[PDB]
Amino acid sequence: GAMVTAKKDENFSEWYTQAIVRSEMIEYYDISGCYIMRPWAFHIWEKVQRFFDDEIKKMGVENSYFPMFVWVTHYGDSPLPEKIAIRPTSETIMYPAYAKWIRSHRDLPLKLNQWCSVPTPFLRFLWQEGHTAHATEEEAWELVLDILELYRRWYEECLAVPVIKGEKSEGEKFAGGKKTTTVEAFIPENGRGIQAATSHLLGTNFAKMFEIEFEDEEGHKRLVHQTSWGCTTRSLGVMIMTHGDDKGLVIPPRVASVQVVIIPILGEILGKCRELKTMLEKADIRVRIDDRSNYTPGWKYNHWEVKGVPLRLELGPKDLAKGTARVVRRDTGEAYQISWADLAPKLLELMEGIQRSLFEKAKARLHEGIEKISTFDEVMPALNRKHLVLAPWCEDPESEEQIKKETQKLSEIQMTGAMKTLCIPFDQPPMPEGTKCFYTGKPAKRWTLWGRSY
Amino acid sequence: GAMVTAKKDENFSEWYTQAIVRSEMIEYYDISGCYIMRPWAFHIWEKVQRFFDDEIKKMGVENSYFPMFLPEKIAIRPTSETIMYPAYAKWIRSHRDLPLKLNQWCSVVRWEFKQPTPFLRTREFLWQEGHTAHATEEEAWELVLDILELYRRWYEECLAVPVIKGEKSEGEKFAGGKKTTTVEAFIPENGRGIQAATSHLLGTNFAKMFEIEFEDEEGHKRLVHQTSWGCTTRSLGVMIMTHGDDKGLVIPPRVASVQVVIIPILFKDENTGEILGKCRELKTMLEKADIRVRIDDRSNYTPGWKYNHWEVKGVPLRLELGPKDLAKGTARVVRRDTGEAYQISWADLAPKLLELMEGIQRSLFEKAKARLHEGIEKISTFDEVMPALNRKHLVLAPWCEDPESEEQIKKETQKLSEIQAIEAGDSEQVMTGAMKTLCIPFDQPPMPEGTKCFYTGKPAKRWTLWGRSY
């Protein structure tokens, strides 16, 4: 009787917990935080993993395994045993091997990636990270933007979660990198931004510290231009929060463990159900026939609705007589009495329509969750409406810290509560000439998306 | 210009180290032995992983992830059973919940062994492990045998390494389970058997231990019949030892990262662009046939350097194209396994190369199978053991399957090993000289009535494969 009792707009954290637990997605035990990823979510992880892996195989990225863990001048001209102690990161492990392997320009580009594995689930796990080294900065930037587009496709085309491409501020970018691109998603229930995925342009900063030098065509020793990117299982959690409802989970059909479940209504109907399942499995459709004995049909309805199957198929005596089956979708309560012959094509059409509907509704909520302001006195109401803000900014690093401190102090009205830079979006609205910064008053530079975040 | 200098049948350990390092499929990181797995070997691991995963997904096995707070290479780590089987008991409630089939692909790196061997005896490896629970013992045993057949296909159809299916002795099986099946491989250069993969019939012991019960159709609470299996990157190591030669590695074309390497022959600054463009269009043509191709147009190295480089890396086929071959409209394809050269027209390149590839794979398999057949001696009495062991061979003997007799034989063969005091001008890795049961093979040779045990003299039960092991 796994039935979600908490309401999504009321008790959001308890709703998330009940949704991820009751749907047989994860399983806790007594120690704090640790959980087990049951197949219901690991199938989604696999699907997105296969997508990203094939797409980076096309780009020439090769997978590998490095033994990874669990300031300017000194870290750089110090030996590797001390470099590991100072910064025990994946860069300190990988980039010495990069310096050993890279010697000639014909050794570039070097593209490596690894899928690694080692509170609240799916927020703070499995992930992937990749590192590249190129001969020029233009090639590095091209690869960074390609990976960011791959992340946009990961979130929007697979999980139906709309993300905003942008550039991180000087305070939120990678510490040693030159520039950091990102994609951002929005959770309306708490009105908070979240970093969906990240992609960094490291440049020659790390090549300086590890002496990752190469000889070009003219025989000149030049530094490589490195990039690094990564994406975690957070994509699952976001995908859980943007589509679920009070009934439970709603999983987009492109990543569903089982896309359509066939429920009998209670002799020959079981054979006809198996025939329909064999017919549907041929057309790429993932089918599971829930032929439980004692469980009532409504119990199975609630079970598969909590699990979040996009479509469920009912076949009863009247359905067997009139020649049609009763399919019902999960995002909305729309039902369809459809013939057995036209089952597979119209079912996959319904699946694509459900995916597009989920993405479009999430994009509409995203657009409704952003307020384009101009002066600072609008930030506190906009934040109190569970919304993000898009304001003109001069991109002064001190101003960001000042705004965060003041917005945290302006939390008199009873995680955190401060407002930080989500990103400087690539899609920049037009900036009038004399436009001033929304906080300092200096000449503004670009439109920056701010808001509360995870 | 990294060449493999050690002879494979003279300095086997040095040969293995040179072969894995100079082929750019491994990179040692520090003094402890910690190493990086480079894409040249990770591609083979990805191929075998894709095969096994697609095959077990047809069996209804679903992938999952469990963290960390005989099973082959796992004499370390915090155990998988104590983490999984509590959740298994919490999940399984009725026969409707069965059968349960889970699997996970994992990787680990711990403090390295004393005198380690990467992709073999090492505390750093990638692997997969699966666990199942069934209502009956028959279904569980059938799944065990299906997984063992999948392992046989993993080693033979993918890596071209012949293996022997069998069951472990009472003293060499998973002590917690009921019966432990296995596949065994043979290394002739040191004459040692090795456990390629394992599949266990755990039975109801862990069901009792973790209270994993279920209600049947009538209502009685019964125990589940559990199985578990696993396979590591050790396969790669075996695939390295089985097909490698004095020149370096020989990778079967099915799992090769690069199947055909194109080497344009360019002398002087004349007719270079035409040859390069022709090599590029040939690469595109071959890629249109699902052939993995790569062109080595590096000018700082001569053709001989490239030959040795891609021979050490183990590319099964290389394609030479000079200006004379540009004129004749043909190319010279050299195979890595035997070295035989062929002259093939451009229109025949893709079909003849797909054919050469299959031929090299089958030959790679058949030669190793012949070596395996030649490394096993069928004996009848115990005084035949130490000779056959000194010939770096295994033995197939009739045995009564007495547990204490196996320990007696281990101690006796260790006492009779001798020569444990002369290392000449070439010291290698010293392993134990005792002989133990590798497996009781499924393919049992016929047993004539009245056959006595080769050691105890008691009535012999079955043919058992003994030998020195890893």
From the list B325, B323, B322, B317, the residue with the least C-alpha distance to B346 is: B325
For the record, the structure tokens of A335 come out as: 């039902």
Domain A1-252 belongs to what architecture? 2-Layer Sandwich (3.30)
Say which experimental method was used. X-ray
Q: Chain A contacts of B63, Cβ < 8 Å?
A: 39, 42-43, 46
Burial A156-176 (b: 16+ CB within 10 A, else e): bebbbbbbbbbbbbeebbbeb
For the record, the structure tokens of B34 come out as: 């910690």
Say how far residue B156 (Cα) sits from the centre of its chain. 9
B358, containing H or E segment: helix B349-374
Q: Chain B contacts of A65, Cβ < 8 Å?
A: 36-37, 42, 107, 126
Say how far residue A103 (Cα) sits from the centre of its chain. 36
Which backbone phi and psi does B156 adopt, to 5 degrees? Answer: -100, -50
Nearest to A65 among B42, B87, B300 (CB): B42
Q: Which residue has the tokens 């989970």?
A: A249
Asked if residue A75 lies in contact with residue A83, where contact means CB atoms within 8 angstroms, the answer is yes
Q: Chain A contacts of B46, Cβ < 8 Å?
A: 63
Asked if residue A23 lies in contact with residue A2, where contact means CB atoms within 8 angstroms, the answer is yes
What is the Cα–Cα distance from B43 to B259, expressed in whole angstroms?
Answer: 12
Supply angle C-alpha A134, A45, A164, rounded to 5.
60
What three-state secondary structure class fits A98? helix
What is the Cα–Cα distance from A405 to B213, expressed in whole angstroms?
Answer: 57
- Beta strands in B64-178, from DSSP E residues, in sequence order: 100-109, 124-134, 164-167
Q: What is the domain class of A370-453 according to CATH?
A: alpha beta
Expressed in Å, this structure's resolution amounts to 3.2
Residue to substitute from A28, A46, A58, A65, interface B, most B β-carbons within 10 A? A65
Q: Which residue has the tokens 């945290």?
A: A408
Nearest to B298 among A27, A38, A106 (CB): A106
The alpha carbon of residue B64 is apart from the nearest alpha carbon of chain A, in Å, by 5
Nearest to A67 among B36, B46, B67 (CB): B36
Q: Chain B contacts of A34, Cβ < 8 Å?
A: 67, 69
Tell me how crowded residue A426 is: count the other CB atoms within 10 A of its CB: 12
Domain B376-469 belongs to what architecture? 2-Layer Sandwich (3.30)
The alpha carbon of residue B57 is apart from the nearest alpha carbon of chain A, in Å, by 11
* A107: closest chain B residue by CA: B298
Q: Which residues of B touch A (CB under 8 A)?
A: 27, 29, 34-39, 42-43, 46, 62-67, 69, 86-87, 90-91, 96, 102, 106-107, 109, 124, 126, 298, 300
* B66: closest chain A residue by CA: A36
Sequence-ordered list of residues with C-beta below 8 angstroms from that of A405, at least 6 positions apart, any chain: A418
Q: Tell the CATH topology of B253-358.
A: Rossmann fold (3.40.50)
Q: Chain B contacts of A93, Cβ < 8 Å?
A: 29
What is the Cα–Cα distance from B45 to B127, expressed in whole angstroms?
Answer: 9
Residue to substitute from B59, B64, B210, B301, interface A, most A β-carbons within 10 A? B64
Sequence positions preceding breaks in chain A, C–N over 2.5 Å: 70, 118, 124, 266, 414
- Dihedral through CA A136, CA A138, CA A144, CA A146, nearest 10? -120
Sequence-ordered list of residues with C-beta below 8 angstroms from that of A220, at least 6 positions apart, any chain: none
Domain A253-352 belongs to what architecture? 3-Layer(aba) Sandwich (3.40)
* A25: closest chain B residue by CA: B64
What is the Cα–Cα distance from B233 to A79, expressed in whole angstroms?
Answer: 32
Nearest to A63 among B36, B46, B91 (CB): B46
Q: Where are the domains of chain A?
A: 1-252, 253-352, 370-453
Helices (H) and strands (E) in chain B, counts: 12, 20
* A295: closest chain B residue by CA: B96
Q: Which residue has the tokens 């662009």?
A: B273
From the list A260, A57, A253, the residue with the least C-alpha distance to B46 is: A57
What is the Cα–Cα distance from B39 to B46, expressed in whole angstroms?
Answer: 10
What is the Cα–Cα distance from B105 to B57, expressed in whole angstroms?
Answer: 13
Q: Chain A contacts of B38, Cβ < 8 Å?
A: 64
B465, containing H or E segment: strand B462-467
Nearest to B39 among A27, A63, A126 (CB): A63
Nearest to A37 among B39, B65, B109 (CB): B65
